[PDB]
Amino acid sequence: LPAPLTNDPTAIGPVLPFEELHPRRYPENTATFLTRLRSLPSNHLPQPTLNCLLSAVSDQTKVSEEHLWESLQTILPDSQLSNEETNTLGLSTEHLTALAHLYNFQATVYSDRGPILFGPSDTIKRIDITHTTGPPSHFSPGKRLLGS
Amino acid sequence: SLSTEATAKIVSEFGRDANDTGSTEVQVALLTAQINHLQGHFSRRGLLRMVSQRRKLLDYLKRKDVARYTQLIERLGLRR
């Protein structure tokens, strides 16, 4: 079990897969990442410097980055929102899954190696987000396909 | 849920007097006792519901008076 997560003051209860705490119809091997129930209210963390996942989702949902970020703070413990990883490498498809649950959409992520689904299927809203390793590793709104 | 006796004891501890049931502190403390009871058996839905409501009450209090919020969460040991 992730030690920072098990000592996170904003969290309560056992460490469990996201989908166990927030059951939806998630694609296989997504929503399996470990987390805990959010207990304490928002600390109003600064938006991440590396925030283009939020910008990409914002473009697609018409929800401001600030609102997306405050929403994440209602469901994930702070240790999962502000840490060494987020500050150096940015947000991840785990955050995307959390947003997809909160805002009831399913995202198709058009990665360098093809489209990947993240978010609950028991939804109507659909969004498109592109990811590339680049460099730099970058999310953006819309579709992208590669091949020969 | 909570017996009338348990409820009364919590109101006494966290409220101004027995009639102070508008107090956010009291409401949060009552939920906490139920939440702790529920984990004591471990209705995962009931647990989420209470944690969620409590979080929103805490948010309400934190926005009004950070110092009261801080004192309350320490008294209840909500920081693990």
Residue numbers in the entry:
A (entry chain A): 732 to 879
B (entry chain B): 1 to 42, 51 to 88
Provide the authors' own sentences about this structure as they appear in the paper.
As for many such viruses, TYMV genome replication is dependent on the activity of a viral proteinase (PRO) to properly process the virus' replication molecules. First, its endopeptidase activity is required to proteolytically process 206K at the HEL/POL junctions to release the 66K polymerase, while a second cleavage at the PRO/HEL junction contributes to the regulation of viral RNA synthesis. Finally, we recently reported that TYMV PRO also displays an ubiquitin hydrolase (DUB) activity in vitro and in vivo, and identified 66K polymerase as a specific substrate of this activity. Strikingly, PRO displays no homology to other processing proteinases from RNA+ viruses, including that of alphaviruses, and the closest structural homologs of PRO were identified as DUBs from the Ovarian tumor (OTU) family.
The asymmetric unit contains a single PRO molecule packing against the next PRO along the crystallographic 31 screw axis, making up continuous PRO helices in the crystal, and an Escherichia coli contaminant (ribosomal protein S15). S15 bridges the separate PRO helices, explaining why diffraction-quality crystals only grew from a PRO preparation heavily contaminated by S15. The continuous helices of PRO in the crystal are formed by the insertion of the C-terminus of one molecule into the catalytic site of the next. Thus, we have captured the N-terminal product complex resulting from the self-cleavage in trans of a viral polyprotein by its resident proteinase. The catalytic dyad Cys783-His869 (TYMV polyprotein numbering) lies at the interface between helix α3 (the first helix in the central lobe) and strand β6 (the last strand of the C-terminal lobe). In contrast, the catalytic dyad of TYMV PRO Cys783-His869 is completely solvent exposed. The last five residues of the substrate 875-Args-Leus-Leus-Glys-Sers-879 are funneled in an extended beta conformation towards the catalytic dyad of the peptidase Cysp783-Hisp869 (where the peptidase residues are labeled in white and the substrate residues in black). Second and most important, we identify the Tymoviridae-specific N-terminal lobe of PRO as a recognition element for surface patches of the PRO/HEL substrate, as this lobe was found to recognize a signature bulge made of the two successive cis-prolines in the PRO substrate molecule.
